[PDB]
Amino acid sequence: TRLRIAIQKSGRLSKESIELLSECGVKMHIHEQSLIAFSTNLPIDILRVRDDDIPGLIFDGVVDLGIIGENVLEENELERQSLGENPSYKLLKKLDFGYCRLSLALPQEQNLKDFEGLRIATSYPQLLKRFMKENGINYKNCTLTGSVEVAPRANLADAICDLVSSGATLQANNLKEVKVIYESRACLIQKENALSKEKQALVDKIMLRVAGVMQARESKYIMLHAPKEKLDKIQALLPGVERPTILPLAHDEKNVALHMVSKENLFWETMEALKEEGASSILVLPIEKMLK
Amino acid sequence: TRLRIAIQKSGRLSKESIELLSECGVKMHIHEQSLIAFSTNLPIDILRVRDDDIPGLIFDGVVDLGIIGENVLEENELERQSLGENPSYKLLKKLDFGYCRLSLALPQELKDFEGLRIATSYPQLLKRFMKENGINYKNCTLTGSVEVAPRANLADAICDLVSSGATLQANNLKEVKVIYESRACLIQKENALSKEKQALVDKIMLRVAGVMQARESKYIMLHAPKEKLDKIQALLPGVERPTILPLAHDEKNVALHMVSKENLFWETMEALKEEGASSILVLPIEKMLK
Amino acid sequence: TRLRIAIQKSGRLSKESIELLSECGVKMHIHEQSLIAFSTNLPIDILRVRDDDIPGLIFDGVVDLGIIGENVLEENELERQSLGENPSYKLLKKLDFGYCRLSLALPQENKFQNLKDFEGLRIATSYPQLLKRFMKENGINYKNCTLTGSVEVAPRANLADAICDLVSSGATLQANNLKEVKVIYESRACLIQKENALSKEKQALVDKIMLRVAGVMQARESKYIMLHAPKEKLDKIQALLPGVERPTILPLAHDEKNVALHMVSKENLFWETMEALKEEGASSILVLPIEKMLK
Amino acid sequence: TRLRIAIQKSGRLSKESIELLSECGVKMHIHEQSLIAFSTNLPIDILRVRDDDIPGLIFDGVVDLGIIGENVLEENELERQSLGENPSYKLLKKLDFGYCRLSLALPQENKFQNLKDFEGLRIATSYPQLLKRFMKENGINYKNCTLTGSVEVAPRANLADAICDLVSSGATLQANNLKEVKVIYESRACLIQKENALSKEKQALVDKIMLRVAGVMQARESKYIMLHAPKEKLDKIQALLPGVERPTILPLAHDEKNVALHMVSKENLFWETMEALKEEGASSILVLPIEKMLK
Amino acid sequence: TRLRIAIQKSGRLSKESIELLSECGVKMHIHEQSLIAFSTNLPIDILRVRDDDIPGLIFDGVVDLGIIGENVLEENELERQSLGENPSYKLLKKLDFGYCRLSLALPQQNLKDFEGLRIATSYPQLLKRFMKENGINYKNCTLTGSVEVAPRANLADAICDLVSSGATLQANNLKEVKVIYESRACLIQKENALSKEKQALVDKIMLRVAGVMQARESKYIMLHAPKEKLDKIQALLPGVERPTILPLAHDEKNVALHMVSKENLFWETMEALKEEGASSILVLPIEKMLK
Amino acid sequence: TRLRIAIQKSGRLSKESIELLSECGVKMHIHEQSLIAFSTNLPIDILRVRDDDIPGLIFDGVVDLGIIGENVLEENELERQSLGENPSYKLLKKLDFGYCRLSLALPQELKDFEGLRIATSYPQLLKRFMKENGINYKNCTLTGSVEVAPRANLADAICDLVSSGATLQANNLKEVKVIYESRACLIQKENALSKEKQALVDKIMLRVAGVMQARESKYIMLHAPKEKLDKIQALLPGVERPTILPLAHDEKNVALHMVSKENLFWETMEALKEEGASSILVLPIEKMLK
Ligand SMILES: N[C@@H](Cc1c[nH]c[nH+]1)C(=O)O
Ligand SMILES: N[C@@H](Cc1c[nH]c[nH+]1)C(=O)O
Ligand SMILES: N[C@@H](Cc1c[nH]c[nH+]1)C(=O)O
Ligand SMILES: N[C@@H](Cc1c[nH]c[nH+]1)C(=O)O
Ligand SMILES: N[C@@H](Cc1c[nH]c[nH+]1)C(=O)O
């Protein structure tokens, strides 16, 4: 049988989940009508489903791997625990996308006790519940799967417990963030029961590549020209991951090419200082995978 | 404040819920981006939400009315009971759309379900039914595409919502047991409404009944010889008795009008013609009141 | 040549404009890519364009008729007048759709809020010219923020302090924590025609269409009511449901005591007296549609 | 087994085919992903497919009924005949929708243009087989350019010199600077059935449906007219609006001078005599829909 | 006049065709309504049409080049031959996308097991030719879409269906029995000679197409290793010719080594490279490669 | 407060504007419903609006930066000047996308425009040009489909935006006069920014230059005999001079690397092979700094 991986059918995670699988060498033809997309080059089946189903599919052993936000994973874990079940899974990797936080927020027109008795709208009723029990606060519930941010101005609720990627989003609905109750990111998870030897080996291969993809994010390959005499000064500004590669230029004994891996943001931050030190013809090139 | 009604944002019930509101006199401009559509002529706000949210909004008193399938309503009632809560609501009316049933099905190739993985969108309904019948099974919850699960080797069987027997046969599945029958309902929250809101609900309910009573009925008109009245009346009696109308410069023939269920009309149409009926017209009826 | 009519390509007006033309006997095949849809049964070309173009096409005589909101029409009339031009058109009919109003609104304060409270504010709107005229007439100064869509977001996103916005319902503003302070313009859809006379044949076609437009308008919100009642109750029922002139009375087979009565009624009035009709002995009451009514 | 009917998946005929089945009492849930929609109240399966497949499915007996344009039906019939096969089917009914024609057209020149002007030209079309037969019959040679869509663009894009195009309106060609020169085929929607006899129960179901289809067709374009007039004017009004048979005459409450008159009329004839009805004393004129009419 | 190229209007094939033209230096603005997109930098017109029209446009000389699957090309060639015509074209290049196969499949078993069955397919002409040659009789069911549903919906007994993956059939409870046709995208040209200037433009494009094709699945690998390990690493990752060797700053023990590699071979030897002392290994894209 | 940048919501520029911001280090989550997208890593808000609004938002100081075509910018500048206002803005950079021209065209069948009805989306640019040339004409403003106007008999001629000469010829129109040439620009409002906002703009501009300088350039690598260095250098000089790299166990051949414009590379590629170049690679370059 083939390895089954469940990803979000469409949405935030979906594009990034697909891109990640593609960079890990999985080729597939995705038809928006089909539940499953079959890999053309590897024994892998990609299930594209509603995000909320993914944890359950992993807990129940229906699929082997899943990519899902920690928030959705924990919300569902809690729902199942409170129904008396014992869900389990293996965390393989916390990914570098899907960054967001779950925040209690009130109208700008302030404290945690100010939430006592309020109606609070959320898509994550279970995370909200646990947090309010732990802090001894009573409140009335209003579960909406979408458009939570509109609830207060539409007079459906007094406050919200909303997922945001940016502080500014709340301010732009005249809401003040009061307490962050959960921080999340996309994870790659695996079901509890051991896989067959061949499936596990395939998972291991994929993980090597996942690390390579993750390690390269935000990094670029920098090339420049400088006088040999300036090597030490430039190296101090742009050290590389180990040390600069040094390359001769044709018919030139005074100048060299230097190559270094750098985080893109650090490069821009020292770019003008590199020029002051005599660097010229500076190139930025992409890197798709990095292995330490 | 305005009366809040929650309906399905898009889908099976969404079109019918909107149509029904429109036939009940509610005018509104629906923008697919907004959560709320405000009625332009009445103090009513229509919330367009995911179906699965509607029961919760009614249980928690966030909205006043909802239109939702019995299946989704009961699934969510069960989930809340099993978390120890006590959800309540008022059933106002079982509606004439949204008919479907939840059915256990197996590949063509009840104790036969013991130990199987069963895919469903309604895990809680499935659970209750299998407890009541002492059957153990493994779960596979999918929100869409449950019918694919067996042929894709995700599960051995399904507990699927269907509107037609034939759908299962066309995925090489045999229906084995119907475990739930559902249809659209209009429901209201438990806590009493204000006097003005309740009066508005009452008005709407009079019209809803009118809409429901007229479904499948048509106004039939025809010409016949006066001599044939009795024979035609026996074929098409009307809701009370035929209206009889003179025709210009004619003493031998008349027009007759009667309400009829559309299916009964077609069933007796040829016999009406054999009895001398001609120029037969079928007109729509939008509301009927007893 | 064929008569040209311009309607909104997509949107609020758009569905209703098409429906109206269809009820006036115009059959056509609408392909979402084409500028023009040609009528299959009449010499009429329907141009489907951005709403904002329609007034200009009528002013410049490019098309013969148009269906457009008064608000868009006047905004564009003002823009052209302020560029020194003299736009003109014929108003044929105000239609029973596209109702909305243009309203100054501010963020809610639990207080009486005034027109002077707009002095110095940045005000977002899609109708800068209507806003401008109104604020000159009331001697108020303000800063401008023209957005073609999403005006209601401007205050909460901190792009502006206030808005001048099109609303169909009072409640919409309340639901963005905005208080309607002053209605500056009321609008509905209109059918308009260019200034320069049409050819005799085109004008005759317009006249035909107008007869039907009136028939469509006059029937909106009306229904044909039919019911059974005892003859003895005629006067009491007639007082409750008078009809457009007087009830039609129709015999029932083999019955001298009861009759059928038919009357046209506004749907809302019918529902308002429905229970009283039943108390007076009415039964098997039917509501049927009416597509056109002519006085 | 259930009766199988094939209709166009999306497009021109698609909406009308579905509407027609619905008016014939077939209830179904149509999901845009599925090939088949199953009727919820009758033993009928609706296949929604590409139009070009339908004739083949009927010819090969895969389905029992189909709704398809004559043009597509004949194009496919010809293709199969020229491959040596013998396709057959039963025509049940020609429907009142899908009207269009296939026309040879050229770029406008300031001159009279004719059929011999096509000799040697490259002619773009979606119906190569209908074009071929017509040009053989008229002894004209030409070069082919088959496009499934956008045939109207071929001349201006310099892909071809001329076209043989499907149009619903004369004006569409004029509006691409093409002159219609010869109509080579006229088409409309048809309901067809496969050659091999159906089971008794399936055939009885087909027969039921056909009774309704006729009722639907006979009512198209007809309305139920009601009005008030003085009894004295009956003869004059009857001459203007005779009805299907003769006017129904109905008393009005407490009135011996006026009556209500009801008559079925084609909508167009009604509008054509409407003003004359008013001149003869008609008032409160109503137009009501009719869904089915049976002779 | 400008060079005309026909490509699929929409579908997966459409995107790869556009990407390929873009990597060959053709810039254009594509509006989903227009038949034609005009190149902004070259005298080229791109026609975006239904796939099934492309062979015909080439056969009839309406356009100069086309990108189309072999399956669709041969299906239409056969249809035209059987109507007595003589279609011709030039094959310029078999491309590196659009791989699929046309397979007879039955519900979950031989070729003789197809005798007398109704077989659904979108390629009736390919199916016909194959069954004549093998002396098998069968009844036809032509569907342009959803062929895989035909057996379970009881429209047919079997199918002759295009597939990109073995697993797709197994997931509809169908067993692949015989592959009757293998296909991939091709670049083709009409039969009649082009003008000198158009043919020269085609030739330029072809040089780039080859460069694009030769680079697919290859990456530029860079790493650090001790000078002492050069031979062992070279044996694991030989490069297209031989590793480039580069000094590192203030270091006489270690060097950087660069080599082109097929991506799959790289991953297959990656851990062995690390065992041999490789570190800071980078994978970089390559857009074109020329021999 | 955060820096506000306005870009086209959807359209020609829209994708390129987003790409350019992304290459300048702005990460964001773009939901097609929202007016604003907030940058996740920088204090920047991206407003996605109709193109025609962008100049106004800059002139009125509502936003800090905008990306817009010169054509739309000047059309709106003119409209505002003719209403008596004084719009101003700072041009930061002419970008390398959005190239097009506004051209008077007639049916194939300048004084020839006197008295004609001329359709256009840019009435104000047309007006100014015709005043300057003393020509009278009648107007027909359409926001879309201007090219259809003559064949549909809505106008006699057009003043249309085109990216290619061939587009007009393919509607049987002849280009007669180019009246305006445009490309996308990055512009900024007139009133000074806060020190911190201006510094952020300056950072972004350094990157924008890097992006622009790299467009159409590639990093070329190849093998050649050491003896052929001079001949190859003359064919492919690099931006300064070729990098030269030893190959393993080889004293006769070397690797050479050079930056080149992609078109010049293809133009000399066969001559490089004649001179003994082999294993030639083309790699992308994302930014180049002088
Ligand atoms: N030597 C440079 C670049 C490089 C890494 N790996 C290979 N080359 C660095 O250490 O960053
Ligand atoms: N008298 C007819 C029709 C009718 C009902 N109500 C009014 N008219 C019947 O009893 O069916
Ligand atoms: N006589 C009824 C119904 C009617 C109007 N016109 C024809 N019939 C009324 O006046 O309302
Ligand atoms: N008596 C009218 C209306 C009618 C037809 N059928 C029943 N009523 C006519 O002959 O047209
Ligand atoms: N010399 C290395 C890298 C390279 C190829 N071409 C230029 N450099 C190899 O042969 O793979």
Ligand SMILES: N[C@@H](Cc1c[nH]c[nH+]1)C(=O)O
């Ligand atoms: N030295 C080569 C490549 C290069 C530029 N910058 C760094 N390396 C050139 O001058 O084009």
Ligand SMILES: [K+]
């Ligand atoms: K509020």
Ligand SMILES: [K+]
């Ligand atoms: K014309």
Ligand SMILES: [K+]
């Ligand atoms: K079956």
Ligand SMILES: [K+]
């Ligand atoms: K299977």
Ligand SMILES: [K+]
């Ligand atoms: K041309």
